[PDB]
Design a binder for this molecule. Structure first.
Ligand code: CL
Ligand code: CL
Lengths: 391, 391, 391, 391
């Protein structure tokens, strides 16, 4: 039949994949090759099938097709990293003199590319509060090629109204690019809401197993062809290795059941934190006091596996808390099967001036939690123990 | 001791590698992880050791250190592809308004990046015949940041005098970047001749096994740090996967013995071709009639594993010949353990106007051969059979 | 702390694993090595730590420890295959003159080893209906070393009362070995019910991703040491490769959520089949008409992901049905993320005399289904379509 | 054509391998699957192509075919380990009441299987000095099924005359099994000299990269079919993982050039040692004073990469020497790209009574060296330094 016709869990398992025609092997083979051979001079010219992995590969093709199906896009393009997904996309679309309107609340490394790299190539970027679609509209210029957003966004899990922003971008002649890393296609589908291009770090939930760095771009065939044959081939060279593609295919098999459990666990933990008198604030789209709660309910099928919260006692309390957990692991990644915790003020933004962190929504007591697949009772006990100690 | 002190074969085997301290495992472990954990808040801030694979990884570090030792450079940086090695380097070094002087005889995909991508970012490129160092000098401008060369260069294996070009570049305040892919560090060491930065596609000889796409950059620590923390992190995102790094480490173990055999085989095959009346020309640095033979003898320890030659009878003869080989495989890669053959006029440049191919040194009868590790007698027999048939 | 103290899902994620001490890498490194190096002559003799992978390996050790925790056993031993787990166990325990009492309803390849291989080594085997514990007792001899059972058992998913059989075996001085492949430790824990040794094919649910052949043995340290240093080292040589161990560790991360979904899906499908007038019988421990339903409820936490059923119309109907499915895949494995279906009478037991199949509970219309992670509605629709066509 | 017709180096590269028909991928794909799917009920029964990896796999098939070609045998069978190659072979061939005549000078773990395991299965073994073919003849009985030999043999690299022993075994109705691990097919071809079955630990030279544990069996199709469908399937379960097969295929690509360099290096080192006044004896088939030198010249194309030697000063000198090397690595494996050294009296046989070691040819001063691919000058310097210190 056509994989586009099955239910979402069925698609997660099957889309883009089939038994190997030649051998019947059920697992997608790992085509760990650089070289592809032609049967003749004619068959070589015809393709100029496969030719060379940095242009294409059967293992990676399966991943690209699967993710395109899951995001309801025409085509996918795998990359060496989430960063490469973003930069391959933007460097394909933009040239000197062009302009981008970007959310301010975005991944830190994206922010560096946008604030420092792009302008050195003559591409200017305006940063705005994308929670306020009017700020996006006001920042648009005749030269604006792209509006770029992330939702939910760190560090307080604020949201962006994708459909509304898409309409604004399109009326003003720009494309909307959405980083859907935090949600995965299981929880949010930006293309269905009017986005033109979706990017992911598959490093997070899509792979889910904390053992692959990689990215994916999904969009129209016409664009993806340019991202592949110009962006990857002629700019970033950010190809994904076939082994990484195979691991990601393997990881994504369980995307549905993983996201369900991540989100079930996260909701329980969020409610625990909201009831804890030593915790001043809890940021989680699943809590009704979230400023954009109703938007979240329309736009997201589940509230996600990530929680941020503020512990009483500022910087020292935050440090003491992360130093006091015994089960949660101290790390800066997210979307793994293990629960990960970090305290940005002391771990990643320690050198940054306290007042500058504050402006960026990073308070001294802010803790970010990536909820894993453990028993939530064990995670809650670990948190309760650490919070008691830290306060 | 210090690996920098052992003989070159010893370095090939050992440099950058040692038994795992914790377990004694001799093979470098495959650190197929995205996430690294900290023991405390303090240990997390201290590093901001390892943190996240796209910034660094112990497996990839071993490869980088080994290649730095082999090229006699301070530091190495692994990438997702040869292309990414080149673009990460150049996009790190250059910004809008800057200028590059490049050889015309370079890898095709490099040429696209330089001719189309760079100018769209405001970076201008002059192409010159780098076999004539005076053309390099004449093309330099106050804005020139980089001179970029490849040697030997396709498709006729012409050479570039690295030491002479380095002196010219430096006197005029530019860096010299050399693509050393064709030679490998076993056969040529551009840094020892004054180059500032060496790049490779490890996809070719360094890996040697036709199953990895990847690149490497070697140079001063100061530059490599920028290529890593800005180029990779903030521009291309072109990180190498740890599995690919491990395979490359494994492949490079045999670099010395592979290059010796490739070159022994190639010399035999080149001499056979030079004696064949149906072959009009043979391009191989190991043949004394090579226009830059003596330069090759000073600059290269071995003449390489690649040969180009022209078969009598033009386009149709070239097509018939590649369609008539039975052992050599039709492919566009090089540096594999298998002998690979291609006929650019019919396979890769078929759409290109015949007169434009001619200007680029690609004649209708030109065949390129990547000589593998087979018995040279079998390769010669295959070639002899195919040539007889084609003519 | 101690991983033995956390909840079962937490153990699934964490047991046997921790961040790499030296690097902080969260993923268990792949120690793909054969060789381990010593720091001195003394450190070499001391171990005679690690020495050589076929004796031990840090990656494989993590898997062994995890599975020991999950089965509530002292120690684990990984093997090249489920078969090797069984034969390494039995060949370690038994010698010429010894006797084994085995269930008749066991894995086919086990049956070959027991019926043909063992007797040629002077080890005699009695086969009994293990659904009747009295038959086990009656078959025991002074020479009986082992009682061997599988539960649930193919092809009608009959059960064996582990606790009762354990008591009988022990009173008569024998060990009880249980193949727990069908259930996984998530659904059944034979050691907790008195079994001495548990074996698995990890090829099925423990890995769960259809890309690893492997086995595991769990039991007392004293026995496992013998299985390792004599059974593996001196009899079967059936070591697991570190890469396979790593993939299995990765697969087992999702064991809990996978089993929950497999069993939720299977129950739905079983109830659908039980309501279908073209289906004469449905064998599933989750259906109350199962002959040993109550035993199943005490012994198993979930009824499993495997269903067998009989379609009206015998051999031709069974053939037509499996030839008519479009989503379910025709294969003989089980426990994969994809739904797999087979018709033993036409696929695996076709050469076997119809009357002999009947005696073994394999009727002409019997179909076996391994329910995957797809939407159960899609699987049901596929089954409904195929059944309608087949009848 | 037919790979059996090309030169040996060509066969090393190409035999058993070809570009993937479906995709053109040059590297043999890694078919990391457990499950194979059928297109129909009929196609399923027909095979009962591939079915299940423990029975067969396309990646492993390529390795088996290649090694069969290299040993000039009909068929190959890959296994989980060298030990499993040996035991799968012998347990397939022998049953209770049968007898084996074995060399005494064999791999230690083989000796355990033969001396302890076999007799417990009713299979008796006589050990003889296989350097004396008359001892083999004298030990043969009506029940003798197999004569088993290893050549060269540890720990003094004594030889066995394969052709002569084959003739004796055959006249008395037995098969000859030869462990060809030390030589590899590049240096010795026992089947060409009359052996019936060859086994290897591919862990050593065939893989050559110190990162795979595995074995191979090569022999007649009729026997290999039994070793596969009974030995592996019904006795040891010792299947090789497809990833290990792929790594071994990759490693064996360089077998020819590796063996040439190992042996060139070893001869140089052996001659150095023979000239050293602190070294009482040097055991190396390449030295003319080897007791069976001429036999070695007829039977072996190269003298190998392994050397044993005795250092003056017995146990303490041996310990001091291995504790004094700085480049050579202390390990018990062999055939790796790194030079490995061990002192059996202090490292592996330390608990063994000194007088018992002596009987087995293991003197207190005996050192075993596996010569790697380093510059031999560096290895010699390291040895010279250590010997001076130790004495
Ligand atoms: Cl290799
Ligand atoms: Cl997985």
């Amino acid at each position: 039949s056509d994989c586009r016709t099955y239910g979402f869990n069925t698609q997660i398992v099957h889309a883009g994949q089939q038994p190997d025609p030649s051998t019947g092997a059920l697992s997608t083979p790992i085509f760990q090759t650089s070289t592809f051979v032609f049967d003749s001079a004619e068959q070589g010219a015809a393709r100029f099938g496969y030719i060379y992995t940095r242009l294409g590969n059967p293992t990676t093709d399966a991943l690209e097709k699967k993710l395109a199906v899951l995001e309801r896009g025409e085509a996918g393009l795998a990359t060496a990293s989430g960063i490469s997904a973003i930069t391959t996309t933007l460097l394909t679309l933009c040239q000197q003199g062009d302009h981008i309107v970007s959310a301010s609340a975005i991944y830190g490394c994206t922010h560096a590319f946008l604030s420092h790299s792009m302008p050195k190539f003559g591409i200017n970027v305006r940063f705005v509060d994308a929670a306020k679609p009017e700020e996006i509209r006001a920042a648009m210029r005749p030269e604006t090629k792209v509006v770029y957003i992330e939702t939910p966004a760190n560090p307080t899990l604020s949201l962006v109204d994708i459909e509304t922003v898409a309409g604004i971008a399109h009326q003003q002649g720009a494309l909307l690019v959405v980083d859907n890393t935090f949600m995965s296609p299981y929880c949010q589908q930006p293309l269905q809401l009017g986005a033109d291009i979706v990017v992911h770090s598959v490093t997070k939930y899509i792979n889910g197993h904390g053992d692959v760095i990689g990215g994916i771009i999904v969009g129209k065939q016409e664009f993806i062809d340019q991202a592949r044959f110009v962006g990857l081939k002629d700019i970033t060279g950010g190809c994904m290795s076939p082994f990484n593609a195979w691991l990601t295919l393997r990881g994504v098999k369980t995307l549905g059941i993983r996201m369900e459990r991540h989100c079930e666990n996260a909701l329980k933990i969020a409610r625990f934190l909201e009831g804890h008198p030593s915790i001043t604030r809890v940021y989680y789209p699943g809590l009704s006091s979230h400023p954009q709660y109703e938007l979240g309910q329309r736009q997201m099928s589940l509230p996600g596996g990530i929680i941020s919260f503020e512990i009483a006692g500022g910087l020292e309390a935050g440090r003491r808390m992360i130093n006091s957990v015994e089960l949660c692991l101290l790390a800066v990644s997210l979307g793994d099967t293990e629960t990960l915790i970090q305290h940005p003020a002391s771990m990643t933004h320690s050198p940054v001036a306290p007042e500058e962190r504050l402006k960026a929504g990073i308070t001294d007591g802010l803790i970010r939690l990536s909820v894993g697949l453990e028993d939530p009772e064990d995670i809650i006990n670990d948190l309760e123990h650490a919070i008691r100690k830290a306060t």
